[PDB]
RNA sequence: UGAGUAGCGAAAGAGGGGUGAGAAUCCCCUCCACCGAAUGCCUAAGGUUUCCUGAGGAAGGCUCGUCCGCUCAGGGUUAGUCGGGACCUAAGCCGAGGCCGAAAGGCGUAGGCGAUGGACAACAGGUUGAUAUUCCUGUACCACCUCCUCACCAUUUGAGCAAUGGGGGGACGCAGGAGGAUAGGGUAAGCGCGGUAUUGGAUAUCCGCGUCCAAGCAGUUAGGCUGGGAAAUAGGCAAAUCCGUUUCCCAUAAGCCUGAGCUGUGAUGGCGAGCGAAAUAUAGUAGCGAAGUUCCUGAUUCCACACUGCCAAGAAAAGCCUCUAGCGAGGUGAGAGGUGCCCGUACCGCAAACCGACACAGGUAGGCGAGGAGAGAAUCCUAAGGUGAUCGAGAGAACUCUCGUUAAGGAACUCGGCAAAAUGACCCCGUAACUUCGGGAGAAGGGGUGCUCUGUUAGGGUGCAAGCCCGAGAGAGCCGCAGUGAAUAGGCCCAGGCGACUGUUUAGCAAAAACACAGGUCUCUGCGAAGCCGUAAGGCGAAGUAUAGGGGCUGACGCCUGCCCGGUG
């Protein structure tokens, strides 16, 4: 049966990309939380 | 800069490449940002040989784990320049 | 005319379609075609402000200058064409300029008949001349509210209007269903009621034709869950026990006036609600 | 040869139908 | 601990050898089995090397293991023509100034982004342990540029280039039916084979092969132009010998535009059944190489949304075709010389290389998809191509499951004909109540279809003939329990309640007497709308206009739909 994960790189990039978060201040906050914790891999 | 001479890296020594030596073509690694037009001006300067149809290829690096620590190989970009007939090789020499 | 279908199938038992006798050419002129993206009734925000819209057949707009701003220039009715966008049929008219403009079509028009858009034009059907020159009591269609704005009034098929008389300011008019307004005397209008009166008589006859309209089905309110609709809840076909029949929005619908008691148009309302 | 080896374990879940009936 | 107990993940393997310390599981050979409208290939998504060669093998292989999609070493994707970007535009999004909003931001022009679309030039064989409409051998094609080679012209009396502008064209729905031709199958001919020891065939015997493209050139299936010529123009922001419009001339086709696919050229080239060396690092190639016709059969493909019919009337722009505005001193018309970039190219994609914790009985566009019977991408058996689908051995207990059978009976079982059985394939006979006259209706109920001959039938398809095919109707005969013999392709007759119907609904307990629908009715709404989504701006309704929209109620159709305004709105 069909499952929730049906990958598409264009979708993952447009929705969860670094500039998708740069597009709004809230996403900048997401990046800020991403960087304060020292994550090796920001965004998607 | 820019200069033709710095564009090249090292020759590709493979059994597949040695067969191409009779094809009047010689593989060479080339900078990733370099274009085919730049490579054509390199052989004409460095080797002095007339250039015909140049082919260029890029390779994604393979994983090369060392114990716990995995790591991607650097992306090589060899080029294939098909030299014109009647032209001495400088390779190996 | 109306072509009744033999009940070869359950959907044939009631369905009917108009004769399409007025139609002459199968295809529209390319020059005046315009795109019509279907909003589906959604807001620009993306939310659906209007219930049960979209899903209909694709449509392509034909340019129509209701304003008829040009004047003194005779025209000619070359062709008549079907209009998916509205019940009224479209009739193409060739101007003496060589200009071409699709125009609203009153019934009884003939192919090749002359039509002048000017004030000096004859009463004869298809002409559009200012209200001051219009004789009292003649039928009029495509009336503008203000000059240069286009005729929002009486665009649908089979509708009509009549003049009760006129002053310098403003000319009286009988709007459909008997309502009356003092429309501006300077304002332009077109004599002769719109054709395709038989459209009201048309029977859809099946759920499938409605999809092409495309009129999406509407759930009855009592069937709806109480959280979604005021008349919801109950143990099977709940009685409209709650006081005052209601829309899903809080305003009552049966007999409740939705009019703003204060409005700029209120002065113009000489008459209202004849029922 | 390093011969490194790694093992991973996960709890997962879940069902709860629960298929239980009565008393009512 | 339960236990050495459950499980070992659908569905054929057997033998001979080989490798090796170790072989049921690895490799090779010979049989056999399964898919074959795929368990076949080709290519997206996605995975990101899992591909290849040489080794290793402790762990990951529901088991061993010399073997792996494992672990190590190197090796492997080649493009002006394929896909995408140096072209365009849709939904949608971003969005200078701007319109709004405590702030943050929201909205929206110009403009830009964005294919799932439009535009666009390369086709045939060969090659490796791989990657090939990329490398190679042939023939080509598009665009751009002149140290060049000829041909034609003109110096503002202007040869030509001709737009960001105006038109033309691109440019589009569904269904159906003739037609032309082809990708594909089969027959007679042709060429290479074999005389077969199991009774009998140099014989209406047997096996195998039966050709080839984009293009540059010619014309043809045929469709579309509705006509072309002249004059006049309140128009297509300015202009136009362009378009549109108007008026005359000639209209039975001169002319105008596009064609599939054919014949010869592309090819004195290569594919090809079969021979198959030296030997090399003994795989098996190099290398040699015949015939290459004709008829029947043909679409779901193409000409092409071309034609006809229909309603629910069915994208957008650029590339192009022209027109002037505007640029001008050297340009055009053909040959030669060169230039042509940036990314994706491996493998797995019906799957053990992905969605699923797994090497998981499920899930995953689309493009090719054969033969015999058959209406057929039904069904059964088989080509092309794959698959031996990775725990087994043997006893033949209960018991559980998947099935096959059944003496005499039948639904006596049971909440309930649940399940199962039976019917079902074509042709023909025949067909009721009721009804909205369409139906009901494969009503029901019966008969005939296997094989042989008269019969290369009667009659049709194509063909000059010759031949290949589509094929009843019958008569006479032969057989078996049997005859669409296998396999899959309805069980009906009634009587009532509810619901017009198709359709939809709780994915993962309930699909329905529920929902919805057309219809019927009430009410509201006059455009700066009633209703809304929003603080607003904006937008939906609506490129709508009371025969149009919003909301409530009722549910096709037929007969109807009574009384009450005190109370509550």
Numbering used by the authors:
A (entry chain B6): 1 to 44
B (entry chain BW): 1 to 93
C (entry chain BD): 2 to 276
D (entry chain AZ): 66 to 89
What did the study's authors say about this model?
The ribosome is the major protein-synthesizing machine in the cell that converts the genetic information present within the codons of the mRNA into an amino-acid sequence within the polypeptide chain1. In B. subtilis, the MifM leader peptide is located upstream of the yidC2 (yqjG) gene, which cannot be translated independently of MifM because the ribosome-binding site of yidC2 is sequestered within a stem-loop structure in the mRNA. The B. subtilis MifM leader peptide is 95 amino-acids long and comprises a C-terminal region (residues 69–89) that is critical for ribosome stalling as well as an N-terminal transmembrane (TM) segment that targets the MifM peptide for membrane insertion, presumably via SpoIIIJ.
We present a cryoelectron microscopy (cryo-EM) reconstruction of the MifM-SRC at 3.5–3.9 Å resolution, which was used to build the first molecular model of a Gram-positive 70S ribosome. In addition to the PTC (discussed later), four main interactions are observed between MifM and the ribosome: Two contacts are observed at the constriction, which sandwich the MifM nascent chain between Arg66 of L4 on one side of the tunnel and A751 (E. coli numbering is used throughout the text) of the 23S rRNA on the other. Two contacts are observed within the lower region of the tunnel, one between Phe85 of L22 and Ile74 of MifM and another between A1321 in H50 of the 23S rRNA in the vicinity of His68 of MifM.
